[PDB]
Amino acid sequence: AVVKCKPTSPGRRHVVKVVNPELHKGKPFAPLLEKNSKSGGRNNNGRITTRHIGGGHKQAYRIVDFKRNKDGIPAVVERLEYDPNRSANIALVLYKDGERRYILAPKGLKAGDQIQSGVDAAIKPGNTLPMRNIPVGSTVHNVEMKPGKGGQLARSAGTYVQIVARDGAYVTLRLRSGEMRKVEADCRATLGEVGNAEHMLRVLGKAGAARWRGVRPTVRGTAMNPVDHPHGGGEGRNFGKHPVTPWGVQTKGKKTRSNKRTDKFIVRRRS
Partner 1 sequence: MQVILLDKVANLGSLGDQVNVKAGYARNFLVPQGKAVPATKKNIEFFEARRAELEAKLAEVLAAANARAEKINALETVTIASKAGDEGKLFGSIGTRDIADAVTAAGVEVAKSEVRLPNGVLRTTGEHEVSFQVHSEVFAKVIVNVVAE
Partner RNA sequence: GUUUAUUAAAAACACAGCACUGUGCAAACACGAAAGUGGACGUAUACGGUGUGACGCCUGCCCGGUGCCGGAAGGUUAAU
249 is a site residue for partner 1 (CB under 8 A): no
In the complex, what is the shortest distance from the CB of residue 237 to RNA, in angstroms, rounded to a whole number? 6
In the complex with RNA, the residue whose CB is nearer, 169 or 249, is 249
Which among Mg ion, RNA, partner 1, none contacts residue 236 (Cβ within 5 to 8 A by kind)? Mg ion
Q: Which stretch binds RNA (CB under 7 A): 70-78, 127-135, 163-171, 196-204?
A: 196-204
25 binds RNA (CB under 7 A): no
54 binds, among Mg ion, RNA, partner 1, none (CB under 5 to 8 A by kind): none
What Rg value do the Cα atoms of the chain yield, rounded?
Answer: 22
82-141 positions binding partner 1, by CB under 8 A: 119-120, 133
The number of C-alpha atoms within 13 Å of 241 and in the hemisphere containing its C-beta is: 17
Please say whether the beta carbons of 149 and 165 come within 8 A. Answer: no
What is the C-alpha to C-alpha distance for residues 191 and 24, in angstroms, rounded to an integer? 23
Separation of alpha carbons 145 and 152, rounded Å: 7
Cβ within 8 Å of residue 251, ≥6 positions away: 243, 244, 245
Quick check: 32 binds RNA (CB under 7 A)? no
Please state, in angstroms and rounded to a whole number, the distance separating the CA atoms of residues 114 and 77.
7
Candidate list 58, 220, 255, 270; residue touching Mg ion; CB under 5 A: 220
Pick 120 or 167: Cβ nearer partner 1: 120
The candidate with the shortest Cα–Cα distance to 167, out of 134, 132, 194, is 132
Site string for Mg ion, 26-65 (x = CB under 5 A): --------------------------x-------------
